[PDB]
Coordinates of C-alpha atoms in Angstrom, one line a residue:
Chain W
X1 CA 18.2 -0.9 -34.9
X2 CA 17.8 -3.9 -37.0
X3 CA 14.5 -5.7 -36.5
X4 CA 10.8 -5.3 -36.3
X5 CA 10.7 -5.4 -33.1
X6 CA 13.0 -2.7 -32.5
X7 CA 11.3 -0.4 -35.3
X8 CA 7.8 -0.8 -32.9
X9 CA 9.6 -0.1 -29.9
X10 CA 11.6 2.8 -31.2
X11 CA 8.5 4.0 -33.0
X12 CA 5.6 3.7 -30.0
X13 CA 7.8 3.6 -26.5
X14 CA 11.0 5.4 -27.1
X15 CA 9.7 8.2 -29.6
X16 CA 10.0 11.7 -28.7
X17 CA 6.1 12.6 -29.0
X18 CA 5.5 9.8 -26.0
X19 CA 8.4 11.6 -24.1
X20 CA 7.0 15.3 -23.7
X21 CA 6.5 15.1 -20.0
X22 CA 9.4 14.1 -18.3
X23 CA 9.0 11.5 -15.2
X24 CA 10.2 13.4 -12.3
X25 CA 7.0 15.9 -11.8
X26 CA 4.7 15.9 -15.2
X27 CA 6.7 19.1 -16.4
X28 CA 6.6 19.8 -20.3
X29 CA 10.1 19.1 -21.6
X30 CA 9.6 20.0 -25.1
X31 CA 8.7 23.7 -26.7
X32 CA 10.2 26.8 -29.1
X33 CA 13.2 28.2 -27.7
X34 CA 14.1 31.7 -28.2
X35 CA 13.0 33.5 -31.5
X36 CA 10.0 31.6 -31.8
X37 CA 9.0 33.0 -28.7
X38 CA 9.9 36.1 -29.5
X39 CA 7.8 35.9 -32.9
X40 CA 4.6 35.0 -31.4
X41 CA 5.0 38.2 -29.6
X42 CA 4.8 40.1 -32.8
X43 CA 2.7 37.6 -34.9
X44 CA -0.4 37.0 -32.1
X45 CA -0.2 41.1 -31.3
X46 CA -2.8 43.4 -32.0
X47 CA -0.9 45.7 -34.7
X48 CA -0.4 42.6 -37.2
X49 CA -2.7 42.7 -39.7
Chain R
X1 CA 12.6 18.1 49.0
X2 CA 9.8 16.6 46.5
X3 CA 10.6 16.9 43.6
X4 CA 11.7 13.7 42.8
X5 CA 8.6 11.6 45.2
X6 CA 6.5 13.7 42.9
X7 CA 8.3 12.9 39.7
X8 CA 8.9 9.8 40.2
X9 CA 4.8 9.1 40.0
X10 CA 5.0 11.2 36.8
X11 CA 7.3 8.8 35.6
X12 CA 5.1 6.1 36.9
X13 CA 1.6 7.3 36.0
X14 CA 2.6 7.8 32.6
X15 CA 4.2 4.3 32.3
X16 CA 1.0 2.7 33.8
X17 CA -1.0 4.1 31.3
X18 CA 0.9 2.8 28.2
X19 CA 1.0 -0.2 29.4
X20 CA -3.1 -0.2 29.7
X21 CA -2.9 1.4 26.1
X22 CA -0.5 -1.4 25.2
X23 CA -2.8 -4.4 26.4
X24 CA -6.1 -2.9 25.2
X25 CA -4.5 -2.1 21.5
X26 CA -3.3 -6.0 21.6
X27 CA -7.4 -6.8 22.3
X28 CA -7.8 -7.7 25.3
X29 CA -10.4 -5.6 27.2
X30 CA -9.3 -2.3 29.6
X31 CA -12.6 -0.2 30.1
X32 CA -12.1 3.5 29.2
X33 CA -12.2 4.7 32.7
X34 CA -9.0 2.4 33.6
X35 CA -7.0 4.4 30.6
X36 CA -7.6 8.0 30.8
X37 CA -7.0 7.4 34.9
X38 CA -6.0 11.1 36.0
X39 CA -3.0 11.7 38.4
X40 CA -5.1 12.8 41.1
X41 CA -6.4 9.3 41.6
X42 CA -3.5 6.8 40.9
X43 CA -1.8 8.2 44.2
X44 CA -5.0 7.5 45.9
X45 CA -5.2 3.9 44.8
X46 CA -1.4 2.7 43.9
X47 CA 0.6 5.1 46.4
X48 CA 0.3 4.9 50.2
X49 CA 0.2 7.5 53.2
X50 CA 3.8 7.7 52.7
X51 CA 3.6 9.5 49.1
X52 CA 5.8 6.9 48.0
X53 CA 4.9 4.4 45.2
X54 CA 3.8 1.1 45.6
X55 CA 3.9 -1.5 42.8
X56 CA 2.6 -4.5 44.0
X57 CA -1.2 -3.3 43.6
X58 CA -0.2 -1.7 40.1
X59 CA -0.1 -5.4 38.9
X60 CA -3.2 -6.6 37.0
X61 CA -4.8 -9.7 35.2
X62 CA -6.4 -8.6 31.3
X63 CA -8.7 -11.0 29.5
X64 CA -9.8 -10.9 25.8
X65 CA -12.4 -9.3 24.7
X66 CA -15.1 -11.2 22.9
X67 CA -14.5 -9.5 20.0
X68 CA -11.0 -10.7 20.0
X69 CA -11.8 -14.5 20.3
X70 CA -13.5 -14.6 17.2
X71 CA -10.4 -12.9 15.8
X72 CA -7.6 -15.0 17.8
X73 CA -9.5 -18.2 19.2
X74 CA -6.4 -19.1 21.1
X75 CA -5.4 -15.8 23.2
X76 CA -5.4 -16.9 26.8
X77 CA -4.9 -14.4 29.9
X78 CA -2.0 -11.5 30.3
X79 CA -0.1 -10.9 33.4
X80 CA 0.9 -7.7 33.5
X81 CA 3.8 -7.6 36.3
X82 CA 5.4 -4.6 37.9
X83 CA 9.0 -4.8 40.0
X84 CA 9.4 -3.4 43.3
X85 CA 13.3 -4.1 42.6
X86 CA 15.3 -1.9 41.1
X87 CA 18.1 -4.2 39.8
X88 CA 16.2 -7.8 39.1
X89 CA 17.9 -10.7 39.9
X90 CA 17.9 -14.5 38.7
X91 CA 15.5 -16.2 41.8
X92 CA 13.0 -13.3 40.8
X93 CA 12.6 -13.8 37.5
X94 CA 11.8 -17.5 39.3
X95 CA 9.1 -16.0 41.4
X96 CA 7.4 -14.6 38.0
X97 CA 8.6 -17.9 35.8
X98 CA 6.4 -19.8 38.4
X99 CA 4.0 -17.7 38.8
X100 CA 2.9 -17.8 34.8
X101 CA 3.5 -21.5 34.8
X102 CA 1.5 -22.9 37.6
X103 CA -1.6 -20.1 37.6
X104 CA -1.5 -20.6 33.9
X105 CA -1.1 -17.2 32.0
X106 CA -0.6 -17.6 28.4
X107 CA 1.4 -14.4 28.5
X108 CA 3.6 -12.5 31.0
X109 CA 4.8 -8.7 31.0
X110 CA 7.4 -8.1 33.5
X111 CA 8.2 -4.3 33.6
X112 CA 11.7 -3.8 35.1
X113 CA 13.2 -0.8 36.7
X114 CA 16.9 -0.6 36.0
X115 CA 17.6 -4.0 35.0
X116 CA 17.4 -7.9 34.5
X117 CA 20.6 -10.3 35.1
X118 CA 22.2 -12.2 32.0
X119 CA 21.6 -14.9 34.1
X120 CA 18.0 -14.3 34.8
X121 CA 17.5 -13.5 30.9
X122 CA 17.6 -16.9 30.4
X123 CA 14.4 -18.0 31.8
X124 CA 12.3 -16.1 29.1
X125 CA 12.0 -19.3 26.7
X126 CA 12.3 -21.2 29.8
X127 CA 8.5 -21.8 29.2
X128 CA 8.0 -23.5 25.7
X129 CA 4.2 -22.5 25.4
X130 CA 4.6 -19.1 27.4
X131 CA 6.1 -16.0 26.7
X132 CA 7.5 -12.9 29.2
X133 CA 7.9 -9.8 27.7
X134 CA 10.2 -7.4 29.5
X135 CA 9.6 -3.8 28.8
X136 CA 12.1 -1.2 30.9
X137 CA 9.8 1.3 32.0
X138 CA 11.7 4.5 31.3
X139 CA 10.7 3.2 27.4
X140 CA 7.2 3.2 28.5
X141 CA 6.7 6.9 29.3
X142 CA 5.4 7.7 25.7
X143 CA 3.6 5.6 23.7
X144 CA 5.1 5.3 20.3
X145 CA 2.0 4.6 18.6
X146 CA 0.3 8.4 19.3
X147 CA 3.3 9.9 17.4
X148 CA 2.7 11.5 14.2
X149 CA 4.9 9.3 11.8
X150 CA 3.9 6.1 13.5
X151 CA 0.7 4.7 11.8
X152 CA -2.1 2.3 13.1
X153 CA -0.3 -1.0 13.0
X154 CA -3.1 -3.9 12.9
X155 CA -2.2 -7.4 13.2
X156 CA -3.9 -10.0 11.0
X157 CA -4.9 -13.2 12.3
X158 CA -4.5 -16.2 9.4
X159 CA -7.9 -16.3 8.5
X160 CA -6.8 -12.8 6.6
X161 CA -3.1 -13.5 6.6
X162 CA -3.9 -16.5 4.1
X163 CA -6.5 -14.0 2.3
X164 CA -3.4 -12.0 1.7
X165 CA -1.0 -14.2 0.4
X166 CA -3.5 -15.7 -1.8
X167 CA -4.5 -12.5 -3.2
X168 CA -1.2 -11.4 -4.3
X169 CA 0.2 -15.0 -4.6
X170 CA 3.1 -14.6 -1.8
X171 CA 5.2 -16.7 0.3
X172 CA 5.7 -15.6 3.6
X173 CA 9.0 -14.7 2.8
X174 CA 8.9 -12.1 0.0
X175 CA 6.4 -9.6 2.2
X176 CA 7.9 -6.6 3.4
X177 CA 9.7 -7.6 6.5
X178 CA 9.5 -6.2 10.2
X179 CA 12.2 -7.0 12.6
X180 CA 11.6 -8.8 15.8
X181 CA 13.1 -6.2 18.3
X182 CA 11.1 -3.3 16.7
X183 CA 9.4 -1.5 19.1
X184 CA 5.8 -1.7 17.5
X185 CA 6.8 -5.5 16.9
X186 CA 7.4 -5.5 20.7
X187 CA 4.5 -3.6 21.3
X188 CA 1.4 -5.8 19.5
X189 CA 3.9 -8.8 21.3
X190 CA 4.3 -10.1 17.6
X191 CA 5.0 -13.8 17.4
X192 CA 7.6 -14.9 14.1
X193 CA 5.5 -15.5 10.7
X194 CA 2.4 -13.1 11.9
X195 CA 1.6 -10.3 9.3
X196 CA 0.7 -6.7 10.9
X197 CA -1.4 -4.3 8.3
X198 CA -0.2 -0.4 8.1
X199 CA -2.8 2.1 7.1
X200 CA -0.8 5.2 6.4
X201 CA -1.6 8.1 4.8
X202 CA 0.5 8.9 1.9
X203 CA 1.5 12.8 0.4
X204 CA -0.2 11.3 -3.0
X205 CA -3.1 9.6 -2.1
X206 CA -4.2 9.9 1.5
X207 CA -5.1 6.6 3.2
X208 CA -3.1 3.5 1.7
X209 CA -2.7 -0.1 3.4
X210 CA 0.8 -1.5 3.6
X211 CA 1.8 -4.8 4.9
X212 CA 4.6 -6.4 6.8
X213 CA 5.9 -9.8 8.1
X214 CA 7.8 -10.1 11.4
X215 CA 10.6 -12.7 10.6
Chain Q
X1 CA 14.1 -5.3 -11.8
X2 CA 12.1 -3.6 -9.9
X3 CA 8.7 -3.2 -12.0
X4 CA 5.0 -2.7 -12.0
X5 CA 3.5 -6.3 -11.1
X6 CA -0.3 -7.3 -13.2
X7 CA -1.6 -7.0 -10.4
X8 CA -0.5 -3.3 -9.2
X9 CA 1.9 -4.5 -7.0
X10 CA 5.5 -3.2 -7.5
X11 CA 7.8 -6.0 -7.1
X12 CA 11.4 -6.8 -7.5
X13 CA 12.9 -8.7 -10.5
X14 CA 12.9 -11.9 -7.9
X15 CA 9.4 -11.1 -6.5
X16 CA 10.4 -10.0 -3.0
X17 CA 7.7 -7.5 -2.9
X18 CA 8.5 -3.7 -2.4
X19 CA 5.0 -2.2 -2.8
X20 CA 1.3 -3.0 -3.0
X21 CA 0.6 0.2 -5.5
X22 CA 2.9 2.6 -7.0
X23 CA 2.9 5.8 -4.7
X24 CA -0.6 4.8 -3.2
X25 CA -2.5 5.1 -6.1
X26 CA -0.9 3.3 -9.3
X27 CA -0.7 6.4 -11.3
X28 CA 1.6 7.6 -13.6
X29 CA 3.2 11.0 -13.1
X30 CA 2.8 11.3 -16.8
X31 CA -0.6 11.3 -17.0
X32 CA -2.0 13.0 -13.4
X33 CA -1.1 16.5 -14.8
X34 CA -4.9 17.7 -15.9
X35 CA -6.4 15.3 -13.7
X36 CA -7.0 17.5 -10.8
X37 CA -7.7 20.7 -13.3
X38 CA -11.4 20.2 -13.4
X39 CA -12.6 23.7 -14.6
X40 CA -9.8 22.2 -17.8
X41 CA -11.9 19.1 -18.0
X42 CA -16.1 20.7 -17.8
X43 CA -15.0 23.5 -20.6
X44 CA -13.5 20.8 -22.6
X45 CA -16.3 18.0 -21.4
X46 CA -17.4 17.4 -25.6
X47 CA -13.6 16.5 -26.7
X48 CA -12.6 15.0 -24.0
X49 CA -15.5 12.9 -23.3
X50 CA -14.4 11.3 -27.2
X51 CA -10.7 10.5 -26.1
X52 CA -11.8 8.4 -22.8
X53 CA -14.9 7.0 -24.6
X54 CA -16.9 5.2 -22.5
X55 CA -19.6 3.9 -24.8
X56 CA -17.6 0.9 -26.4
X57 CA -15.8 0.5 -22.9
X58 CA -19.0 -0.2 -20.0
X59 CA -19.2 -4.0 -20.6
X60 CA -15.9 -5.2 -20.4
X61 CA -15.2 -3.4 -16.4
X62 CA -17.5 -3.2 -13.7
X63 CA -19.4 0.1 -13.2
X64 CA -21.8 -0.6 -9.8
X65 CA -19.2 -1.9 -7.6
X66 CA -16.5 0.4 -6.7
X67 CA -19.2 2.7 -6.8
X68 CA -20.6 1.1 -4.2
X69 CA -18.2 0.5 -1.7
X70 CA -16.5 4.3 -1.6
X71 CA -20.0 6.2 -0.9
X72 CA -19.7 3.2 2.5
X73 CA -15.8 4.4 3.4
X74 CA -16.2 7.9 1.9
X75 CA -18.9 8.6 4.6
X76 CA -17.6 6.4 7.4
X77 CA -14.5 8.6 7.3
X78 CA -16.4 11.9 7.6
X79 CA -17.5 10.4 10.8
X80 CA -15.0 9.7 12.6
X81 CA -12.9 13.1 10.7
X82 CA -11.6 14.4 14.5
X83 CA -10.5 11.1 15.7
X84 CA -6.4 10.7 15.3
X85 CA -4.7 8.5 13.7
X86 CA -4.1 5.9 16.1
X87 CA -8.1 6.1 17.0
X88 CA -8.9 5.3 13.8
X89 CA -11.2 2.6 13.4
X90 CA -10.3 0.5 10.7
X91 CA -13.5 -1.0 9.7
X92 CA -13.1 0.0 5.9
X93 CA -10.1 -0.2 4.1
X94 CA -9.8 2.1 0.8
X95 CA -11.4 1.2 -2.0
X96 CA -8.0 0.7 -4.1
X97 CA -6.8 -1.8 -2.0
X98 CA -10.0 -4.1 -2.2
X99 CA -10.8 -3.6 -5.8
X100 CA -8.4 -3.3 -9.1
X101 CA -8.2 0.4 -10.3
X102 CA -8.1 -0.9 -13.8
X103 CA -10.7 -2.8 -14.2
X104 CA -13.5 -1.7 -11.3
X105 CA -14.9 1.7 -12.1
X106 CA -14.8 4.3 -9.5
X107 CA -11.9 2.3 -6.8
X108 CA -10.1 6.0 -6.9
X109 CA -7.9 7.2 -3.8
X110 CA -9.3 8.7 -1.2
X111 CA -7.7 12.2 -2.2
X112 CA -8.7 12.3 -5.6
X113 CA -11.8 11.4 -4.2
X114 CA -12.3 14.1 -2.2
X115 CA -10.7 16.7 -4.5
X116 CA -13.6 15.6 -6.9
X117 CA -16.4 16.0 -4.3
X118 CA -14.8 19.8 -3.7
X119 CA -15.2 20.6 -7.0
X120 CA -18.5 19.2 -7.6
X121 CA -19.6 21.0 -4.3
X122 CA -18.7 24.3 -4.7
X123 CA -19.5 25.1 -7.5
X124 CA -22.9 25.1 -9.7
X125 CA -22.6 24.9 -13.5
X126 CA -25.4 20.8 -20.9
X127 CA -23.8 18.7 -18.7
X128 CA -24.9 17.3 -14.9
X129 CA -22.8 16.1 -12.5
X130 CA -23.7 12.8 -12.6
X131 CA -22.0 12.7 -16.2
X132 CA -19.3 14.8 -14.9
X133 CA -18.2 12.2 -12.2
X134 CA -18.5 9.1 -14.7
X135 CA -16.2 11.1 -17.1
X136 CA -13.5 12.1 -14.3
X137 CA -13.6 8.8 -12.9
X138 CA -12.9 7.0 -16.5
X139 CA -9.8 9.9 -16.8
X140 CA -8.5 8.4 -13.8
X141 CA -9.0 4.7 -14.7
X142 CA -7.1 5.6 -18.3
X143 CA -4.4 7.5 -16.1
X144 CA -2.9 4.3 -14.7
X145 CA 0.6 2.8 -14.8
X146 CA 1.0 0.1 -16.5
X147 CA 2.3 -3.5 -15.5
X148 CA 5.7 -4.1 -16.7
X149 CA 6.6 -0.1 -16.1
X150 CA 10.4 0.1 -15.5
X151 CA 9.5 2.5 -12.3
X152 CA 12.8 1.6 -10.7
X153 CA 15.1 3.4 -13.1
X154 CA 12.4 5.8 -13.6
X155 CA 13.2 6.4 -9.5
X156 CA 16.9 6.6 -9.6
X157 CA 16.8 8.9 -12.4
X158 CA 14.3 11.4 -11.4
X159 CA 16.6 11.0 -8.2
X160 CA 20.3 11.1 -10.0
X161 CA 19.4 13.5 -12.5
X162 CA 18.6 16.3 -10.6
X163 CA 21.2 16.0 -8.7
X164 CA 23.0 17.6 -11.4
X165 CA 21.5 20.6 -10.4
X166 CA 22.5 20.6 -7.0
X167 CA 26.4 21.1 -7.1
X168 CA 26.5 25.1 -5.8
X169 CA 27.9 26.2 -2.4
X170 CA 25.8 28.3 0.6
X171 CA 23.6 30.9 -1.5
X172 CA 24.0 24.3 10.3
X173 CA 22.4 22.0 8.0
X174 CA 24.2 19.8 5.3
X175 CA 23.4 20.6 2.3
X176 CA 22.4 19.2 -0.8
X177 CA 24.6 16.2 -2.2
X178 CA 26.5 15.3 0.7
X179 CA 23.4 15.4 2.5
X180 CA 21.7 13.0 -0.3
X181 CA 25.3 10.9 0.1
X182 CA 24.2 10.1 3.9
Chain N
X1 CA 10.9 -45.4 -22.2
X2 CA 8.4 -44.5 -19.7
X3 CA 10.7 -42.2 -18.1
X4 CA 10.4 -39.2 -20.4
X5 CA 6.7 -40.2 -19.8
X6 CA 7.4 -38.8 -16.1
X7 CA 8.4 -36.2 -17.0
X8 CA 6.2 -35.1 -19.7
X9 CA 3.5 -35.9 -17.4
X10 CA 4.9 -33.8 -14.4
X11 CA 5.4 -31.0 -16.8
X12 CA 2.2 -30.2 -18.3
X13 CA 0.1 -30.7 -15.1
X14 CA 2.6 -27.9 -13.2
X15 CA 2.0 -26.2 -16.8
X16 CA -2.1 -26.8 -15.7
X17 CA -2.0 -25.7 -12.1
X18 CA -0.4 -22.1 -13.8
X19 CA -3.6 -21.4 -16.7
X20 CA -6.0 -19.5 -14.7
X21 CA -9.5 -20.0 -16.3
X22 CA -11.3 -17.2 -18.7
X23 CA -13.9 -16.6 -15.7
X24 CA -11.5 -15.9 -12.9
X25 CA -8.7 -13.7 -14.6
X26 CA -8.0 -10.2 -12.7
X27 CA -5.9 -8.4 -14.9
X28 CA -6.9 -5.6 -16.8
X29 CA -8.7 -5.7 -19.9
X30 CA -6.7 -2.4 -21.2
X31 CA -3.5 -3.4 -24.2
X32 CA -1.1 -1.6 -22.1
X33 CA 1.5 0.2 -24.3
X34 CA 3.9 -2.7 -24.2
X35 CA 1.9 -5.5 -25.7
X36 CA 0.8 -3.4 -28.1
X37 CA 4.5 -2.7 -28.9
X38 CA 4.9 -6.3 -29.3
X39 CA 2.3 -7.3 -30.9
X40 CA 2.8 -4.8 -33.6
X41 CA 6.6 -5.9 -33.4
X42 CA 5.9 -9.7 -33.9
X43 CA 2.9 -9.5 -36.6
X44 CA 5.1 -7.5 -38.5
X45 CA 8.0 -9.7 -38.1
X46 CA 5.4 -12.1 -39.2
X47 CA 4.5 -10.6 -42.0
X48 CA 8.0 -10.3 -43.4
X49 CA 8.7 -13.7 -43.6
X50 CA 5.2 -14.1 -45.8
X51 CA 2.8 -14.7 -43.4
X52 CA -1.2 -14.9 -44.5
X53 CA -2.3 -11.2 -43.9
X54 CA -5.7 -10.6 -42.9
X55 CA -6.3 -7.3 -43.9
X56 CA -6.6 -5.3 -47.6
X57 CA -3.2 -4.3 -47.7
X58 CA -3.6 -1.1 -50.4
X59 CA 0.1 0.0 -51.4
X60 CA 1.4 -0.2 -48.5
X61 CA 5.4 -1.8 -48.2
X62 CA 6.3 -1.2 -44.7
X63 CA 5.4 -4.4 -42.9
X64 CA 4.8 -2.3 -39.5
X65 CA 2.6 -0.4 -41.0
X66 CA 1.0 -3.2 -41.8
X67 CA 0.2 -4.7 -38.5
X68 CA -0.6 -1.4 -37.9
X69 CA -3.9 -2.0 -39.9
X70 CA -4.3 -5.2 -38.7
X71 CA -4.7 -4.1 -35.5
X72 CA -6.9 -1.8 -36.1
X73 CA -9.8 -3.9 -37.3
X74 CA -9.1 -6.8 -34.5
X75 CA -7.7 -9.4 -37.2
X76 CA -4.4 -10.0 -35.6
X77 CA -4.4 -13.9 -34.9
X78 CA -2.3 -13.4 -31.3
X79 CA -2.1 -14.3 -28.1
X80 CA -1.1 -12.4 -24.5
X81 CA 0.1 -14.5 -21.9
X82 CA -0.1 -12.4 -19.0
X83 CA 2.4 -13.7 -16.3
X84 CA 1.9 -13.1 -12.9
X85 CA 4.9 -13.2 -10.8
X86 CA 4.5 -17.0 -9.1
X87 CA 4.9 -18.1 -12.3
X88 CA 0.6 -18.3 -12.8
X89 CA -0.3 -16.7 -16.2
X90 CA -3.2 -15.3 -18.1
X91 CA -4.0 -16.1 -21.7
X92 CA -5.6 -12.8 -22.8
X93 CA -6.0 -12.7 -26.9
X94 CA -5.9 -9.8 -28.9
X95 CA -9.2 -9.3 -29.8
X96 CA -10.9 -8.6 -26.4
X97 CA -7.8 -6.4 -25.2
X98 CA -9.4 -2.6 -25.5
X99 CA -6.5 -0.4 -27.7
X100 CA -5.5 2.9 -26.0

């Protein structure tokens, strides 16, 4: 976009930190995917010093 | 041998009671006793020796309650007017169209059996400040408002009609709009321009008030 | 064009009104999703009583009214709690639909209301409850939808979209999108 | 002649029965996430085209970011008409709007 008020607007109302609960029921929509799950597993278990 | 004489009255008592739950949710004043009226003694005061019913007795005069003058200042008397015909014809509709006009009801209900003639359907806005309201009576055996998904229609006089649009700054016309033949429209007896008030309870939030013209 | 009115209403692009408040209560689905978790909200009382802070906030919305008027319906209604529907004397109206939400302190739904009293009743817990009420009733008044909210595409898309979802065969009555078609 | 004086006439008193007064306004006194938007949108487009800024500006080039500090310390020189949808409108400045 190509004015100021399209940088506020894209910047405070379409942004993707305002958009991590979608609309239809308040559900998260945003998170680690596969081997960040499967890291935290390792890195938050009770061997890793 | 009777079990239609009995069920006929079944299909009578119940219809006499919604139409005493019909004029006493309008306002007008029906003691308690006159609604919750138990089989056993409508045969004993409506039906004769013969076990037959009778309709001529079944028909009834309501006044306003005082309550409801203060509310609606210009709610004169109801006629409420059962048919010993089965198919109504045009010269008794003329009998009824008299009746309201020279005694002086503001308001008329003539329950009907089977039918009323085309040419006797013409006499309802034969009376310019009057109104009959014709209600078949197999459509009165259960009273719509008691369902679950019906809720408790109120109808706003224009002391809080005028509150409302001035609140929300409305014309009449951009309200939420309820038909004419509805049958809670039919069963207040709403006029054209009146506002009724729904208070229904929402999945969300429980109790929310709704509104709704009849245009 | 169908949007969230100043004054709660939802209302069509040409003002032919639709609603009075969105879904009963003006709130947006966005922001109800700790408002019911109140063991969430009493652990986290300290932080969270910083976000919604209510000390540079009390003189510009009105804190005795709403307050008021919902201990007057909230205990009329627990009278007349067997009554049905069509019994119902309607005597008091909820306190939402008298009184802005954003702007009178306390006008909650009658459901929140109640879920709040639950809470506060069954169970016994530096805080009071006094303190916990003013702060759960300043989340809700924060948790609003706001006027000019596009909640009529919001609606057909959380409609439209998953019914993208919905496109599979029998895992009597019609099922899914041709259902949704009628 | 006195016929634009008509009109001129007829169009500011409509444009009077529409203000409602500071002591009768019922809209909320929350900035809710779309003025803010805005304002920050316009005072920035302001501030491009060499407006008087109001505020220490310390290094910093973006004009939204900018505003951005303006905003922050209620010296933003706007004003929120509010309208209501009869047409009816609320002037509601910048100042005594509450931020988010």
């Amino acid at each position: 976009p190509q004015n100021e008020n399209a940088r506020a607007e894209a910047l405070n109302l379409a942004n993707t930190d305002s958009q991590y609960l979608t609309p239809t029921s308040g559900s998260p929509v945003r998170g680690l995917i596969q081997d960040h799950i499967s890291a935290g597993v390792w890195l938050t278990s009770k061997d890793s010093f | 041998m009777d079990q239609e004489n009995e069920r006929n009255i079944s299909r009578l008592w119940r219809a006499f009671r919604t139409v005493k739950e019909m004029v006493k949710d309008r306002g007008y004043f029906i003691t308690q006793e006159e609604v919750e009226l138990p089989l056993e003694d409508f045969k004993a005061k409506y039906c004769d020796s013969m076990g037959r019913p009778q309709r001529k007795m079944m028909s009834f005069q309501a006044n306003p309650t005082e309550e409801s003058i203060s509310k609606f200042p210009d709610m004169g008397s109801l006629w409420v007017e059962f048919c010993d015909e089965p198919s109504v014809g045009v010269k008794t509709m003329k009998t009824f169209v008299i009746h309201i006009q020279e005694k002086n009801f503001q308001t008329g209900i003539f329950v009907y059996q089977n039918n009323i003639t085309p040419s006797a359907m013409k006499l309802v806005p034969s009376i310019p400040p009057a109104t009959i309201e014709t209600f078949n009576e197999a459509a009165l055996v259960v009273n719509i408002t008691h369902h679950e998904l019906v809720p408790k229609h109120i109808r706003l006089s224009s002391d809080e009609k005028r509150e409302l649009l001035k609140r929300y700054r409305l014309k009449e016309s951009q309200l939420p709009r309820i038909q004419r033949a509805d049958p809670v429209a039919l069963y207040l007896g709403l006029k054209r321009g009146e506002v009724v008030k729904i208070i229904r309870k929402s999945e969300t939030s429980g109790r929310y008030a709704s509104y709704r013209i009849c245009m | 064009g169908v949007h969230v009115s100043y004054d709660n209403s939802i209302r069509d692009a040409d003002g032919t009104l639709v609603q009075f408040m969105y879904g009963g209560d003006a709130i947006d689905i966005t922001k109800e999703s700790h408002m019911t978790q109140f063991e969430f909200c009493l652990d986290n009382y300290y932080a969270l009583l910083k976000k919604y802070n209510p000390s540079a906030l009390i003189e510009h919305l009105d804190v005795e009214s709403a307050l008021k008027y919902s201990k007057k319906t909230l205990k009329y209604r627990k009278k007349h709690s067997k009554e049905p529907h069509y019994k119902q004397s309607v005597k008091y109206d909820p306190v939402l639909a008298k009184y802005n939400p954003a702007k009178y302190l306390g006008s909650v739904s009658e459901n929140f209301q109640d879920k709040l009293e639950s809470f506060l009743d069954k169970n016994s817990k530096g805080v009071n409850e006094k303190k916990f009420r003013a702060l759960m009733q300043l989340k809700y008044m924060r948790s609003l939808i706001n006027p000019g909210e596009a909640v009529g595409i919001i609606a057909s898309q959380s409609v439209g979209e998953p019914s993208t979802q919905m496109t599979l065969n029998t895992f009597n009555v019609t099922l899914g999108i041709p259902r949704l078609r009628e | 002649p006195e016929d634009f004086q008509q009109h001129e006439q007829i169009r500011r008193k409509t444009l009077k029965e529409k203000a409602i007064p500071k002591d009768q306004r019922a809209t909320t006194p929350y900035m809710t996430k779309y003025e803010r938007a805005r304002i920050l949108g316009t005072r920035a487009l302001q501030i491009s085209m060499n407006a008087p800024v109001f505020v220490d500006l310390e290094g910093e080039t973006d004009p939204l970011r900018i505003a951005m500090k303006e905003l922050a310390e209620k010296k933003i020189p706007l004003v929120i008409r509010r309208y209501l949808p009869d047409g009816s409108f609320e002037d509601w400045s910048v100042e005594e709007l509450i931020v988010d």
